[PDB]
């Protein structure tokens, strides 16, 4: 009779994901805002320059999306990172779309070193051929929840 | 090989992306779904650590929830006016936290959401494919915490 929400055990909350992916996200997100917080490139303008390298030329609304950001808070480190010289705006179609620019390029290629550093530490020693199915289950389980 | 994420392959193929996205979704959901239960994903959070663990210091409840002790301690204090929680004593005396009946009702009452929903996160995958994907959050968090 497989454990169901509510679980009753610590050991069954254990193998529930939506309580896994949290507590490692907030470690995630909480050892890099304070090693960042050295560079001061804030997760703010950490997770949209790295979205636009990602994606390329991205509008705001797509931002605010692969970013994990609200739309108004997107667009106003939007307007810092072009003020800041390091992306621009542009327009294929009409509506208000970013880019990066090689100001933009080079900061990232310089924290880059420190998120790889924090990956590795993350994964630790999971098995390498394990950690691919499980991010292809994650990244599967992304694409069917939108 | 792959950091410098030029592509969205890569990028999605990055662990704390995918941690990142798929995390937002969930609790957005449930927040919203339960909005009219004004069970926020804090307040349901707590709860639902307080089913699995079963007595909890302000602390511990402030660990696995992923807050800040005095939020935490204000999330605790708004489900015991709800009539869900209450703070007890230790077998010392260390301050902790129970669910009550009702809030144990709660949970119950709510079950069918949540299943569901996570029905429809965790639903098509192989559930072999699944059971790795769980063990290994489940690895790579142990040797961060412990707790």
């Given at each position: 009779?497989?454990?169901?929400?509510?679980?009753?055990?610590?050991?069954?909350?254990?193998?529930?994901?939506?309580?896994?992916?949290?507590?490692?996200?907030?470690?995630?997100?909480?050892?890099?805002?304070?090693?960042?917080?050295?560079?001061?490139?804030?997760?703010?303008?950490?997770?949209?320059?790295?979205?636009?390298?990602?994606?390329?030329?991205?509008?705001?609304?797509?931002?605010?999306?692969?970013?994990?950001?609200?739309?108004?808070?997107?667009?106003?480190?939007?307007?810092?990172?072009?003020?800041?010289?390091?992306?621009?705006?542009?327009?294929?179609?009409?509506?208000?779309?970013?880019?990066?620019?090689?100001?933009?390029?080079?900061?990232?290629?310089?924290?880059s070193?420190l998120i790889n550093?924090?990956?590795?530490?993350?994964?630790?020693?999971?098995?390498?051929?394990?950690?691919?199915?499980?991010?292809?289950?994650?990244?599967?389980?992304?694409?069917?929840?939108?």
């Amino acid at each position: 009779p497989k454990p169901s929400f509510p679980y009753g055990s610590p050991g069954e909350l254990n193998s529930f994901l939506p309580y896994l992916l949290t507590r490692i996200t907030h470690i995630w997100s909480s050892e890099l805002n304070q090693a960042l917080a050295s560079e001061k490139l804030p997760t703010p303008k950490l997770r949209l320059l790295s979205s636009l390298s990602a994606y390329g030329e991205l509008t705001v609304g797509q931002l605010a999306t692969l970013g994990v950001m609200e739309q108004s808070t997107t667009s106003r480190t939007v307007d810092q990172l072009v003020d800041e010289g390091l992306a621009a705006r542009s327009i294929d179609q009409r509506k208000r779309t970013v880019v990066l620019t090689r100001k933009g390029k080079k900061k990232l290629a310089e924290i880059s070193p420190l998120i790889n550093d924090f990956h590795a530490e993350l994964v630790g020693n999971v098995d390498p051929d394990k950690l691919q199915t499980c991010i292809e289950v994650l990244g599967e389980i992304l694409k069917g929840k939108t």
